[PDB]
Amino acid sequence: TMDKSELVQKAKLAEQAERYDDMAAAMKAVTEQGHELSNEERNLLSVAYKNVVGARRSSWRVISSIEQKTERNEKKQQMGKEYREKIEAELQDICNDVLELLDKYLIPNATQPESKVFYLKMKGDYFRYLSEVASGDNKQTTVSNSQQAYQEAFEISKKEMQPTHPIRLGLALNFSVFYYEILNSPEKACSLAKTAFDEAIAELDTLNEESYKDSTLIMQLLRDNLTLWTSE
Amino acid sequence: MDKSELVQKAKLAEQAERYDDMAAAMKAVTEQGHELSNEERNLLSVAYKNVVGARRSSWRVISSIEQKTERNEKKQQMGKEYREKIEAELQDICNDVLELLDKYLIPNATQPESKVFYLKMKGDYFRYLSEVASGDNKQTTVSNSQQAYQEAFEISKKEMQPTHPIRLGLALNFSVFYYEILNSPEKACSLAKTAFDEAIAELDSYKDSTLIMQLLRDNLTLWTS
Amino acid sequence: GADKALADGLVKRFGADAEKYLGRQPGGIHSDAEVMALGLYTGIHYADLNRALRQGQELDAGQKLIDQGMSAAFEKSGQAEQVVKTFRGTRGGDAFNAVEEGKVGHDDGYLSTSLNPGVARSFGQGTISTVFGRSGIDVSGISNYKNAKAILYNKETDMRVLLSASDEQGVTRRVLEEAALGELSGHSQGLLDALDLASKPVRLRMRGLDLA
């Protein structure tokens, strides 16, 4: 019914209106046409789902925080638990849909290494989001899948990208946050953030004239995390 | 689900900023047929204010883009279609709250305080329908808004103090209706001025009322520029 | 007229030292006075001129003439069609040592940068900078010792420190941007937002009163 041009415009309209569920549906339909996305289309798809999943991560944290602070009442605890599980169920569906797009279209159709790293990083991100709400066996599966996707992305970035590339730097940031928050490894988090920072400051001459401020901003986030994590 | 469960669910949904859930929970509470508590009434009002609010905001953005585009007929049709999609949602939201107001909230209101609140609310949601309506339907929603606001104002002047926040909030929203919907700055300033003057004459510890009074005074100075 | 008066002033004062630069830019955007002043500076006078500007000393006749020839050259030049990336190395600190990250400052002297990364980083050098700008004058066709392909920025050119960091060797590694570029410059449209970075970015009286 709707062609690619119509769905891309609909997504740009939905973004301005802050109607992210509409933005995500339009970009999901664009992806399912089976053709490789342009950088604009890829960014539209990423912003849409970041906001759709983001709202549930935020809500999950709020309801989790309330669950702990709430009084000893069997009925009240059960309401809170139920409500958290309703948010968890939504989060799982969102992450499963984007992981479906990544495995079926985005990763296999990626022809340039920039895009391959972007989508594998994205795969790591959404498995990390599944890990935050998962427990037991399932947690071990989503935690391994996250590390594996981040590592595959890291391997391609080190061989095919400049150490200042914003996609490579954003990956170093998210992967180091995975080690810190998901694996509870301040050592692995710092080792990764330090190496990425050092490698980038050694080759600032590789900064792209189109994205130099994207690079310096992420480099600041890396450095700030390193000084925060190496406190006292 | 019991009333107690639905109210707790609504309080949880609010904190999580999940207003569609908050509105569904409070709609179900209202449909039980009993008069709502001030806490329950405020929960219902906050829920729908946010649910309708998001669509009013999206509509204004898409409407603004529609005017500034005017270059491609294919782009023009996407914008038109999308604005109409938002409009249809807004109409559904307003129709649900107007259904709750006519079927339960207004007929079960025993105190004038609540009677004024719900009639003011009726005026508000017909005003929201008016913003996106055209032609005959617009004339119907615009009349229904004025009628509900007037009906609330009559009860507020006879049974409420000029400083009551519900009476002051009504004076503010009704004056905004005259200004934005009827495009009558004179009717807008006459209502806002009388409400402000009546309130400053009878002030004799509420920052509540003082805040709404400031909104009314700020509108008066802005409109008499 | 004014160009000829200044051009004559430069030949009277520097003789053959000024005249060797005559005609070195046949893509004649700049006057003879400007081409000779840019040459005299690039070739050798940068050291004495910038020292005097930086220290706030009164300029001698020769320095005065070179400085007005360079000022006139920047007046005529304006902003280039694209952002250019250039490099700069100094044995010690510079005027941006004081400037904190995200804030703007400037050098009192002219700012020589090079298109060649090699004739900049890193052995011996204490502060290494990557510069992004549009108002620089390319003097590579006038003076090009060590094929440095120099791009000069005007004296007192306001630069934003985008990043100031230190190496594990103790080398200050900086990123500067011409303040006049904007704050939306250097951003690839939507990429930061799309990168979903793992980092944190009516009033209260009712609530149940829906105040318009």
Residue numbers in the entry:
A (entry chain A): 2 to 233
B (entry chain B): 3 to 206, 212 to 232
C (entry chain C): 232 to 432, 443 to 453
Verbatim from the authors:
Two of these, exotoxins-S and -T (ExoS; ExoT), are homologous enzymes consisting of an N-terminal GTPase-activating protein (GAP) domain (73% identity; 81% similarity) and a C-terminal ADP-ribosyltransferase (ART) domain (78% identity; 87% similarity). The ADP-ribosyltransferase activity of ExoS and ExoT and their cellular toxicity are dependent upon association of the ART domains with 14-3-3 proteins. Here we present crystal structures of human 14-3-3β in complex with the ART domain of both ExoS and ExoT. Collectively, our results indicate that 14-3-3 proteins act as exotoxin chaperones rather than activators.
We co-expressed 14-3-3β with either ExoSE379A,E381A or ExoTwt ART domains in Escherichia coli (for details, see the Supplementary Methods section). Using immobilized metal ion chromatography we isolated hexahistidine-tagged ADP-ribosyltransferase domains of either toxin—ExoS233-453(E379A,E381A) and ExoT235-435(wt)—in complex with untagged 14-3-3β. A protein complex with an apparent molecular weight of roughly 83.5 kDa (indicative of a heterotrimer: an ExoSE379A,E381A monomer bound to a 14-3-3β dimer; expected molecular weight 83246 Da) readily crystallized under various conditions. We solved the structure using molecular replacement with 14-3-3β and Vis toxin (PDB entries 2C2321 and 4XZJ29) as search models. Numbers in italics indicate the ExoS residues that were resolved in the electron density. f Detail of the electron density around carba-NAD in the active site of ExoS (2Fobs –  Fcalc electron density map contoured at 1σ (0.1073 eÅ−3)). g Comparison of the ExoS apo and carba-NAD structures. The loop containing F354 is in two different conformations, where the open conformation from the apo structure is marked with an asterisk. In all our protein complex structures, the phosphoprotein-binding site of the exotoxin bound 14-3-3β protomer was occupied by an amphipathic peptide containing the LDLA-box in a short α-helical segment (ExoS residues 420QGLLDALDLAS430) in which the D427 side chain hydrogen bonded with the 14-3-3β Y127 and Y130 side chains, and the hydrophobic side chains formed hydrophobic interactions within the amphipathic groove of 14-3-3β. In one of our crystal structures of the 14-3-3β:ExoS heterotrimer, the residues connecting LDLA-box-1 and -2, E433-D442, could not be modeled; but we found unambiguous electron density placing LDLA-box 2 in the phosphoprotein-binding site of the second 14-3-3β protomer. LDLA-box 2 bound in a configuration that was highly similar to the configuration of LDLA-box 1 in all four structures. Thus our structures show that the LDLA-box in the context of the ART domain binds to 14-3-3 as the LDLA-box containing peptides, and in binding, does not distort the 14-3-3 structure: The ART domain and its C-terminal extension appear to wrap onto the solid scaffold of the 14-3-3 dimer.
